[PDB]
Structure formats: structure tokens, C-alpha cells
Amino acid sequence: RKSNVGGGGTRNHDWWPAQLRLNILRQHTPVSNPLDKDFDYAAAFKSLDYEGLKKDLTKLMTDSQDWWPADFGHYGGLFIRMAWHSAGTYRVTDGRGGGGEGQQRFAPLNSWPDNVSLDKARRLLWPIKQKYGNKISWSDLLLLTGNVALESMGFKTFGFAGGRPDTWEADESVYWGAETTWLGNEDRYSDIHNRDLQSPLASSHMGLIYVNPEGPDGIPDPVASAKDIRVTFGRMAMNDEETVALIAGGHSFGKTHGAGPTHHVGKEPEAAPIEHQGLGWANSFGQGKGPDTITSGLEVTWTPTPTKWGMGYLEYLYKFDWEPTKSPAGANQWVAKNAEPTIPDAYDPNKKKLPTMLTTDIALRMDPAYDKICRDYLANPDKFADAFARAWFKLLHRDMGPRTRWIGPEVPSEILPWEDYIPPVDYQIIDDNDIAALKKEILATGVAPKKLIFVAWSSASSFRGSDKRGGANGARIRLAPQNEWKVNDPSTLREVLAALESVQQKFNDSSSGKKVSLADLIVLGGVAALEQASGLVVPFTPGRNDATQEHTDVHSFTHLEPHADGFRSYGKGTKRVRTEQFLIDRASLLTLSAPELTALIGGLRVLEANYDGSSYGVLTKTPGKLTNDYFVNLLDTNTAWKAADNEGEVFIGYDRKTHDKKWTATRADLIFGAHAELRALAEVYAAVDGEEKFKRDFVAAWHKVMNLDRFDL
Amino acid sequence: RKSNVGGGGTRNHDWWPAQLRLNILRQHTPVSNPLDKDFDYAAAFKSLDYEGLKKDLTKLMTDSQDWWPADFGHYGGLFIRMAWHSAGTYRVTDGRGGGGEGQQRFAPLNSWPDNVSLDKARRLLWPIKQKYGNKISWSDLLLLTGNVALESMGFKTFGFAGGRPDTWEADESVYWGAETTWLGNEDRYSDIHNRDLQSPLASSHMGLIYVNPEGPDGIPDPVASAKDIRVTFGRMAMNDEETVALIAGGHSFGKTHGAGPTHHVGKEPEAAPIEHQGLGWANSFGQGKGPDTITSGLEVTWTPTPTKWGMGYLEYLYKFDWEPTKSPAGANQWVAKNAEPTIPDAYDPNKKKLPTMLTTDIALRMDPAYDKICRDYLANPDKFADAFARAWFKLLHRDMGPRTRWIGPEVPSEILPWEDYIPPVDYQIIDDNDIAALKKEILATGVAPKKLIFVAWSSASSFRGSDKRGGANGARIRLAPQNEWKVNDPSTLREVLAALESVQQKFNDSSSGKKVSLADLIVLGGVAALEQASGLVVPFTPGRNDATQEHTDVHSFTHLEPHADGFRSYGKGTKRVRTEQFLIDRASLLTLSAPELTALIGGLRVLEANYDGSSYGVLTKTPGKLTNDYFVNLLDTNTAWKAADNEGEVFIGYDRKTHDKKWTATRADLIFGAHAELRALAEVYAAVDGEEKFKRDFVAAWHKVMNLDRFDL
Numbered sequence A, B: 001r002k003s004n005v006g007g008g009g010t011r012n013h014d015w016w017p018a019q020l021r022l023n024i025l026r027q028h029t030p031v032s033n034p035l036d037k038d039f040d041y042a043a044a045f046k047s048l049d050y051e052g053l054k055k056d057l058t059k060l061m062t063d064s065q066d067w068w069p070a071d072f073g074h075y076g077g078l079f080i081r082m083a084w085h086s087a088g089t090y091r092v093t094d095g096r097g098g099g100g101e102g103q104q105r106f107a108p109l110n111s112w113p114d115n116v117s118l119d120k121a122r123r124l125l126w127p128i129k130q131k132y133g134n135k136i137s138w139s140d141l142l143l144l145t146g147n148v149a150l151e152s153m154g155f156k157t158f159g160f161a162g163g164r165p166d167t168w169e170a171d172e173s174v175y176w177g178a179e180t181t182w183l184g185n186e187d188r189y190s191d192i193h194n195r196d197l198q199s200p201l202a203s204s205h206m207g208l209i210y211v212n213p214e215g216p217d218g219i220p221d222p223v224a225s226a227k228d229i230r231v232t233f234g235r236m237a238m239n240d241e242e243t244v245a246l247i248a249g250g251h252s253f254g255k256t257h258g259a260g261p262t263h264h265v266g267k268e269p270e271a272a273p274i275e276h277q278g279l280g281w282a283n284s285f286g287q288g289k290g291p292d293t294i295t296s297g298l299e300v301t302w303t304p305t306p307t308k309w310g311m312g313y314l315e316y317l318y319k320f321d322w323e324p325t326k327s328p329a330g331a332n333q334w335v336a337k338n339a340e341p342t343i344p345d346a347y348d349p350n351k352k353k354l355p356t357m358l359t360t361d362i363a364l365r366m367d368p369a370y371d372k373i374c375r376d377y378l379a380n381p382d383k384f385a386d387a388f389a390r391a392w393f394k395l396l397h398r399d400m401g402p403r404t405r406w407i408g409p410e411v412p413s414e415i416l417p418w419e420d421y422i423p424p425v426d427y428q429i430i431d432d433n434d435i436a437a438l439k440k441e442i443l444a445t446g447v448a449p450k451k452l453i454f455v456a457w458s459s460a461s462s463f464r465g466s467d468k469r470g471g472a473n474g475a476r477i478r479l480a481p482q483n484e485w486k487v488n489d490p491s492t493l494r495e496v497l498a499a500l501e502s503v504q505q506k507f508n509d510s511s512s513g514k515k516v517s518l519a520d521l522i523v524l525g526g527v528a529a530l531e532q533a534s535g536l537v538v539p540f541t542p543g544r545n546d547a548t549q550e551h552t553d554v555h556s557f558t559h560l561e562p563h564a565d566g567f568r569s570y571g572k573g574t575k576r577v578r579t580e581q582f583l584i585d586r587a588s589l590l591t592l593s594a595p596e597l598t599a600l601i602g603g604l605r606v607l608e609a610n611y612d613g614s615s616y617g618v619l620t621k622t623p624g625k626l627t628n629d630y631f632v633n634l635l636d637t638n639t640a641w642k643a644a645d646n647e648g649e650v651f652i653g654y655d656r657k658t659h660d661k662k663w664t665a666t667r668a669d670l671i672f673g674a675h676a677e678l679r680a681l682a683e684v685y686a687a688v689d690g691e692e693k694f695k696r697d698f699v700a701a702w703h704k705v706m707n708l709d710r711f712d713l
Ligand code: HEM
Pocket: A071, A076, A077, A078, A079, A080, A081, A082, A084, A210, A211, A212, A213, A229, A246, A247, A248, A249, A250, A251, A253, A254, A255, A256, A257, A258, A294, A295, A296, A297, A298, A360
């Protein structure tokens, strides 16, 4: 707050809300990580007594703590909801969210309206975390706790991979929406059965995982509700069959909590008093825990056996007629008509209750597509147990990346369809000699070296580190849909692919156990051509393998196509986001620092990596040679810039004295001479003494981008 | 801006404005720095062609650019205003501000209402910056140019020291106030002829260096304005003699710029259009530069020779009688009654104007203290030239720290009185053998380990890294005023002092050439005792020297006294700042990271380093022994915390099951269990396996704080 000390007062984001900020390129630095400079989590997790941990977790399941009693004497439901919220913030649009980094323990996820009582679920795990030390991460423990919960209650899981490391601060790269009040949704829509949800959002309300459990805007309309679910689960990469299996297999266990009115519930953890030690939502109704618990405000128990696996959910949903009703907190729900109390009380073994359900649940039976799927699962209970295991596995591992980052003994042998699988290498990798020889032979194809660089950059810059999907490995720029991407210049892309293919056959044809993939050739062309342009030895690591179309879902990769790509002078801004805002977002996705971003733009520009051959930002008289001309000419004090039109995207550089026309540029260029912090970076590379340095930084930054997905390393 | 991209949307700061933030402990990381990791500026500066640069700067002075013409054909006035705004934000209260880091390039300083047209000033210097590369920093260059401007106009400077490294981010640890409107000041007063300026501000308006030029809230009352100057210059470390020499010697050159109404002037750099390339304040009046310039809106020119040194300012101020008038922009100014046009026009050699002055200037002749000093400078033109040179030198180097950090060939050999000088070592330093022997001798004294540690921490803990003042070197804890600071526990401090004094004397007797200081002894007392209580070897670097009271201005050191010190469980919050906010601010001043802050408190607490002997946060059964007990007991889920009163500062830890009383604490303790990001740090050290790790981190963090001022190294 604006209090008179270090940390306080009005900030820059206060005076200039529209201004571009580079904070997301400065996150997750070592300084804020307490671990030892050489800590390797993968190695520490492998040394873990994994079955020891699982037993410990199984034990915790029936270990009721008086401070947060276990419902039914078993914490599984709570732990299943914990892990499904950790994982469920994921959106396929930008790949952000999910449980890959355990962000549920930080703001704002820790204090979301959907995350009530999940604070207590995490505190229940501290003793076990304390024991395993740094060999298990909160990121992995949160999810494995949900697996163990399912296995403890008789459900057979599909697998589990660990390796997720821990983070130390809140991640500022995610846009969760623009609304300023919790549960607000006014801005992401643009109401009834026909409103459109704003990209990249995958949730209908701020502070919610997917949908309103009472119904859209609190209206219990289950068909209108089913339409929200399809959309939100679609943006989280789940189809109809997987959505039904998740909700049913999930609400197959536990209960909701809404024992009394919600005014009785206090501050969220980030606003809660310091003596509460990180727990929020202090409840003044009754005991405030156990049976008097208040989480969502809904009082629903779905099955006759909440702590045991079975078909109660789909069975009860299809056997009773349901009528709307209200909860002890005023929330919209449903209850069964003409039915005796068959559901157990969480605290009283002598009581049983009437079946209840949620609007979102009823929606699964009322939507014609969901109905059909639900009846198929009733008709074959085994297909259901299998679909849910599979969808649960997908839920917890969809933001984990290539199987090469998957660790542990429960890792599945079976390749999954959503995996983006690349076949391991099974031949002799090429050596320093084939490499030198291959460079030569590529360049000698007569393919314009600007094409070789453009395509290698197009192949790599496709990675996004949030998700860990994309990149040069697999060479899917050759497959759909990346080959018709406009940003990828498909006519060129093909000329380059034809050339690399021919080179590929002559090598693999020379017999021997040595082979080269196309993914490695595409990078190698950039490498050859870059070396030609700088005179510097450009590093190169072989080992990529080619990928097939079957493991390349066209729909999946539809989300990876940029709207605007500044590294390539493509696209323009929107009414809500400026061109330069899209570039900073893309740099974040490629894990680039601010200086790395700066080097790459100057280099790619003098090297002609513009998607359509425009001359925007080619501030060089020698296109094709890697010099520091871009920077020297941008900061050149005798050039002036006027906008070239009204849109404000292309500009003209002209001589102050003379007024002669010199150059053309976009916003992705001028921001580097306009933004004070970026300009300081450009000044380093534009100094009389900075070219040698710049060239080194660019080849480092280039090689970095070329290996962004090489987890197999 | 809440744009639907990475970097956009509602933030944690929006949802929780009161929430403590750890950003200031994550600043200025290597990731944001472009320079190669080996880079050493001090070495690069020493290799500068220092004289070639001064020559160049001298040529630049008369090198009028058409894009921003020189007044009188000499950019010196502008360059002097530039360097006096770079250095003039300094303040002694917290030591923040000043020109030590070149923060004037970054927001908000680059866009302050007082720094109009300095964006153009710095742009004039880019060619020269481009020439000399990384061997000169903007931080040094900005201030050197101010010195070359004076020399070029016939004034003799006292010296110049370089060594200021550049920065790359805006600094977020400075509280410029809480007003949300530029030039506003409703918040820092808390109306009247005499009001109190709030600590630690040293400016009467937001966006201003010191005072309003038209007068308080724009009223032209010079006496009332003199009270503002005395206060603001007091908070910037200047006395009445130095204040008069600075304003007079400064407004002895150049002019102001207020040619037309200010509604003609456009946005500041941070809000200016992209094609402006970092320059703001586009002026639509006339040519918008040169004679049509509009900077502050005041049209004043002080001396008949604005590009030449002499006594015109003091002379004209004392020769004519003044009447208030208005500027072409409506600003309140003064003009001479009964005079001819004697001062020249900046563009017209055939025009001359009447004597003019500012309210703040006139204030120097109206306040009875300033009048007396004004008169003595008129009486002695030599003492004036010398005072000005010395105040200028003080202005540009007041935040640079010990002479050990000063570099270059124009460094003065004369020791200044505001320096905090420490004599260099002129004897043989103690060797590994005298350290082992003294360690044993000091603990043999029988002084309690908790006192040896507490005093070594009290000595070292006094450093602030903004200013580079404080710390163990010099052993000024012995001197005034630290010797009677309540947080230092003066009774205990004296005891420890006596004991150390005795050890020092026996060592200094015979053993000949080899001596030891009391500063090395105070620090060593801690090391010995820390080793005893840890079983680890605690590093130690000797070479500290003692300092005398003649070089320990008691008014300077009064500002280093903390209001609250969480490391020693001292003090409490105000109505505007919470206890835990004061601790994060103090950690910033000691340059500590978040994990270093966490380690230090757990360690200092089990070692009993509380100022009054309280048991606040001593969460160990074995006090005086270094363990991770602190974090174990803090994060224990079977303990709960009630506030101990209606105040919210002290708390009681009790058992949940038996309600038995366990601990006592303050807000400096509980925040590590409440704040999500700090709690993650504590969890590392509370792990079954984290005690040896912790202990190591604490001895590293301890030795770090012990050498914070050792620039001599
Ligand atoms: C339409 C989508 C979904 C919505 C809107 C939703 C909403 C809710 C709500 C409001 C509760 C009650 C919260 C409380 O008061 O404790 C609940 C319970 C629960 N949900 Fe969901 N849910 C959905 C789908 C799922 C899925 C896919 C899973 C897992 C795959 C899941 C797992 C659980 C569990 C385990 C509980 C019980 C937690 C406990 O016993 O404390 N839900 N759900």
C-alpha cells in the first residue's frame, strides 16, 4: 500500500496503466529460490522412497485431524477436488495454468472463490511434506495425493508421472480476465444461451475453475449450463466423452459444503488475519468445520457410497426425477422426488439422506450429446472406469510436455493420443563429420539462406514453455496444421522442405547405421546459413527425430498459431492488445529474457526473417549478414519517424535534415527505441564496441531457441 | 493494461492492496542485465580515455543540434540542470534516491514534472555514450557532463569520482509519496504557513525535486518558501551555507523556459507516442524548441552572462527591488523594478531583457538566515566559488559511500567532513593464528554468547545499501549516537565493549607491528560465538579499522536509527506501515534476498538476539543453539496463535488439543507462517532434512551481512 516506506507508495503501473511492462521476463530467478545452486529435482525425486510416500498418503486418508475433520472419516473427496483444482486452471489457448508448478499455493489461486477449504487440504499435507523434504515437490504431491485418494477408495489409476518442480512466487504471465470483482463475468462475455467467451479464457467467471455450479449467472438452467461446460472443457482440451467421465467419476466421491449462510464465512487467505497462519475463510457458523462446514454453499452428496468407487452417480442421476431447491445457504440445487434416504451422513452413522445433485450434473443428462454418453457408461461400467482413469491421467499431465520429462515408476508404457509423441532415436546419430558435411551440402542446394533461417526459426519459435508443446523436434512444421500457417509462408516452406528432403535421402541412403532426421536438417540449415552470415561458429546439437501425422492432432495445434508474431513482422494488434504487447507475451512463452529478446529481434531483422518479405525493420544496407546495423540505425539520432497511416502500425524513418525516406518499420521495431528499459538494452548492442558482443549474444540466443524442447537431453 | 494477453489483466496488487509484497528483494538480477557475466565496470572505467571524453563533452557544449537548439549556443545550463536533477532526488532519511544508479533514464523519474526537456538533454549525450561504450556509464556520464559544463564556463570544480554502475530496471523500493496526481501534496502534509513534511519525503510536491518555484501551493510568499527550502535541503543533507551556494551557483547559469501556455505541451515520455522514440513533452507552441521552448512555464534568466561564471546572481538579487509578475504561461515570478534590459536573449544578439527572478530565489534574500549568508558571499567572492564547488561535489557524491568506492583521476585527496571516513590500515593485520587465539580469548571473557552475537549483529546491521553508509567497519557502534540507541541496548553494548577493549590492549602490547582494531574484534566476537553454537566453521575477513568521533557527525547518523527492527524484535508499526513492512524494507536496505531474510530471522531468534531480552519468537527448547527449531515450531500444525491484545503486535502460541501455552510472538515472526511466499521458504528449512542446509545458509547469510561495507576489499 501507499505507506511511507520501502515497498510503498504510488507505482509506475499506477501512473501509466497502458504502459508495457517487462516483468514477465524477469520471473523465477535464482535469487528467490532457496535451494542449492546445483539442485536437481529430477535426481532428488528419483531417490525418493516412492512407495513409502504412497503408504503415508494412504494413511493420511483416514487420519482425521480435529482442526479439519475428515468427512466420512476419509479425506479422498477433498483431496480429489484439491488435485482437480490444481490441474483444472489449464487452458489450451495459451497453455498457461494447470498444476505443473503448484501455483495453487500462491496468489491468486490460493484465494479463489473456487478454492475455499483447499487451504486446509494443503495444510493437511505439510507433515508428509516435511518428512520427504525436497524429494517431493508440492507440485507433484498435490497431484499424487489425488491419485492415492482414488486408489485408496478402490479406483484403478492409469499412471502417474512426477518431475514437476516447485515455483517460488506467483506467476504474473497469466491473464485470468479483466474483471474487478470476484465471480464477475461481464467483461469476458459479449447474455443468455448465445454469449461468446473471450480468448484465452476457459472459465465463465473470475475465480472459478470452469462453470457456475448453480448455472449461468446463477440461473439453474441445465441445458444452458451444458453449453458452458462444453466450451470450458473444450478450452481445457477435453471432449464430450472425457468431460462426462471427469464430472461423473469425480462427483462419484465426496460432498459439497453449505451447512449455513455464507455471510458466516470470513476473509480469504490473502486478506485473512496474520494469526490465521495462511488459512482463510474462518467460519462463524457452528463448529465451522466438520458438519458445520461451509465451502461453496451447496449441500450435495451424490452417492450412497462417497468413500468407495462405483456407479452410484450415473445410476442415481438416471433413476430419479429431480426438482430444484435451495441449500441452507440459498444456493440453487436439485433433489430427488419420491425417494427414501439412502445416502450417508458424513458424521452420523445412524442417518441417511435424500439424493441431491448440482445443475451442472443434471446438465449431463439433459444435453442430448451428454445424455447419450452417460447412457453408454451406464451400459458398460468398465468402459467408464477406463475412460475416467484416462481422462484423469490426462488432466494431471497435460501441461507436462514430452514424455521425456516424465519421471517415476507409474509412468505408462502406452502412448497417449494427446501426447504429441515423438519416436525415440533408434539409429546412429550423425557426427561432427556428417555435420560439417551436411551443412555444406545443404547450402549447396541453392536455397536462399534467408529461407533456411526463416524456416529454422519458424520451426523452433513454435514452442511455448507454459505447456511445453512445440518446437523444432519432431519437425511438425512439415505437417498440418503448421504447413498452411500464413506466418510460416507455405510456398517457401515447401521449397525448403523439398531441399532438405533430398539431402536427407542421399544421407540415409548411403547405407550404414547412421541416419538423420528432417527435424535435425531444418535446424542444421539455419546453423549453416547463420555461420555463413556471422563468421562465428554456431553451436548445434543433433538428436531430434521426425514425427508422424498420427501423433499430431490438427485441432490441438490450432491454438499454437499466433495472432501476431513480432519476431517475423506478422500480425497487428487488437483493440485490447498492442502489437508490442503480443511480442512480450511471445518472448515469455519462449522463456527469453529481455536482453535475449532484444538480440533476437536485431539479428532476425538484418537477416530477413519477415514472413512476407517486407522490409520493415531491415535497417541494414547489407541484408543477410549479421551485424549490429539494426540497433545502430534505430537509435540513430538523425532519423525521425512518422506514422504511415492512421492505424498506427507501420512507420516511416526519414532524415531530419533532408527528409529523405530511409526505412519502414512496425511497432515491434519502434518499441525498442521508445520503451526506456528496452532502449537501454539496444544501447549496449549499438555501441561502437558492441557488435562483437551482440553477435555472440545472438548466436547464444539462437541456439537457445533451437533447443527449447530438447528435454531428451 | 488489463489486456487479454500475457502481462495483462487484474493483478494481485488489485485484489489485495494491503498485502505485503517481496518484489524489492527480487530486483536488479543478472537476467535483466545484458553485460557479459564477467563484466567489471570499475576495471572498464579505469581503462577509459578519461581526457578524451572530457574534451568531447566540451565540444558538445557548443555543438547546437537543430532538433533541440542550445541557448546562447551553449548547452551548459541544461547540462547542469540535468546533473542537479539526477543527484537532487537524494534524501538522507532512507538514503534512497540520488544519481548513483542513473535512475533518471527510467520511470517515473524520466517523466517527472521537474524533468521536462531532460529527455532531450540525455539524448544529446547518446553519440558520446555510443562512442565510449561500456567504459562509461550513464550514471557517471550524467554527472561528469555537469562538471564539464561548469569547467567549460570558467568555474573550477573540486573533483569528480566515478564508479557508478548502470541499472536496467526502474527501482521499486523508493516511496515518492502516495499522492495520485502529479504535483499533488495533500498527503505529505499532515495545511498552514507551517506544516510538517512527512518522512521520509524530501520534496513538497509529487514529481518535484525539492520545492515549488512559484511558492508553496503556487503562492508567491518568499519567506514561506524559505521554510520549504530549509526543510527539503535539510532532508537532502545540506545546511544553510551549502543551500545558498547551490541555488546561487546554479541559477548563476542558464535560463528557464516558459514561452507560451503550457496547454501546448503534450504527454510525458512514458505516455508519449511510439514514434517519438522516448522523448515526451511535444510542444505545439511555435517552433517548440529553441526560443519557443516550454519546460517549466517560467520565463526567467538570472545573469547578464548565462554562459560565464561570476557574481551576477548575488549581485542582481541584491541590486534591484522586486515586484511579482507573471510568465507567458501564468506562473508566478518576479521582475525588477526600475531597470534597463541588461541580460541577453538566448537567440537574439541584438535583444536584452530585464532582470528576472524566482520566488525561491528571492527567498534567499528575505529569510533572515539566508540573507546573512547571501551577504557574506557578496563580501567574499572567493569563499563563494569554493563553497559552491564543495557543495556541488557533495551533491554528486553523497550517495556513493566510502572513498574506497571512489575512482578516477579527479578524486580529491582532501577528506571531507560529510564523508564518514575510516582511516586505512597502517599496521600488520591479524593472521589465522591471532584469530584462533582471540576467538578463544573473547569467549573466555565470560561475556554471554547472546551478547557477542547481538552486538556484532547490531554493528553490521546498521548498513543501508542505498547510501552505502553504516556497517561494522569503523566500529561506530562505539561512538555517538549509536552508543545510546535504544535498539542497541546501551547497557549490554558497553559491557561487550569493555571486554573487547581489554582484549584489544593485550594484543596491542608487544607482538610489535601487529595490531587489531575494535571493529575486527566486534565482528570476531560474533564469529567465535557463532561457531561455538553451530559446530561449523564460520568464515571471517579481517582488515576493518576503527573510526574516530571527529568523523562521525551525529546529525548524519541520526537517520539510520530504525523505527522498527524485526531482526532484533524491536519496535512496532504505525498507522500507515505494518511491522512486517518495516522488516521487508530493512531487508532491502541490507541487500538480502527473500531466502537470506528467512534464514537470518530463524537463526537470530534461536540465538536470542532480541534487543530487550524478550522471548518473542524464540521457538526453541534450546536457546543459544543454532538449529532449525524456529521453522519447525512455527509451521507446526498442532499450534495455534491468538493475538495477545487488541493491538495486533504480540501473539500467543498454544496447543490446539490441550490449550497449553507454548510461545510468544510478534508480527515479524507470524508473517513467515502467514505469507505464502515466505512460508515456502520456511518450509525448506523446517524439513526433516533441512537443518544442515539451513545452518549453512545462515552462516553464509551472516558472513554476508558482516562484510556489507567492505568496499576496501
Ligand atoms: C462441471 C464441472 C464441475 C463443477 C462446476 C464442480 C463443482 C463442485 C462443487 C461446487 C463442489 C462442492 C464444493 C464443496 O462445497 O466442497 C464439488 C465437489 C467435488 N468435486 Fe466437483 N465440479 C465439477 C467437476 C468435477 C470434476 C471433473 C472432478 C474431478 C475429476 C471433481 C471433483 C470433485 C470432488 C472430489 C468433490 C468433493 C470434494 C470434497 O469432498 O470436499 N469435480 N464440485
